[PDB]
Design a protein around this ligand. Structure first.
Ligand SMILES: [Cl-]
Ligand SMILES: [Cl-]
Ligand SMILES: [Cl-]
Ligand SMILES: [Cl-]
Ligand SMILES: [Cl-]
Ligand SMILES: [Cl-]
Ligand SMILES: [Cl-]
Ligand code: NA
Ligand code: NA
Ligand code: NA
Length: 129
């Protein structure tokens, strides 16, 4: 599923992501924009053989199981396929564990390089929330 900007902000907010670990809604929507262009089906193979999945491009090296990332963990206890669902519940739940890991949203390199320190409220501007 490809979410609309306001549609995804509402869904993230309904699943408790708004201000989770102190990160306002616009941070999450910005990160989703750059990671997947709001497409729950997004996948990207990494140099190390791991793969990133879903709206927030969650990586199989630590977070989910795909059966093909040697020596990896599955910290969210989910098959990576769950992160591709139209229903963002698994992506959000897992993102909560990742953002809680110590480096906050810096875990998402694209958030650090494209969202961090920018006017992230623009991502939720005009949305009924
Ligand atoms: Cl947009
Ligand atoms: Cl915001
Ligand atoms: Cl594996
Ligand atoms: Cl594990
Ligand atoms: Cl699995
Ligand atoms: Cl949803
Ligand atoms: Cl933090
Ligand atoms: Na992989
Ligand atoms: Na994701
Ligand atoms: Na894994």
């Amino acid at each position: 599923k490809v979410f609309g900007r306001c549609e995804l902000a509402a869904a993230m907010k309904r699943h408790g992501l708004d201000n989770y670990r102190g990160y306002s809604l616009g941070n999450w929507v910005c990160a989703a924009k750059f990671e997947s262009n709001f497409n729950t089906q997004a996948t990207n193979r990494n140099t190390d053989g791991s793969t990133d999945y879903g709206i927030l491009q969650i990586n199989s090296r630590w977070w989910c199981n795909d059966g093909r990332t040697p020596g990896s963990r599955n910290l969210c206890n989910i098959p990576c396929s769950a992160l591709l669902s139209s229903d963002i519940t698994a992506s959000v739940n897992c993102a909560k564990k990742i953002v809680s890991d110590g480096n906050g949203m810096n875990a998402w390199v694209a958030w650090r390089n494209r969202c961090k320190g920018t006017d992230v409220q623009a991502w939720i501007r005009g949305c009924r929330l």
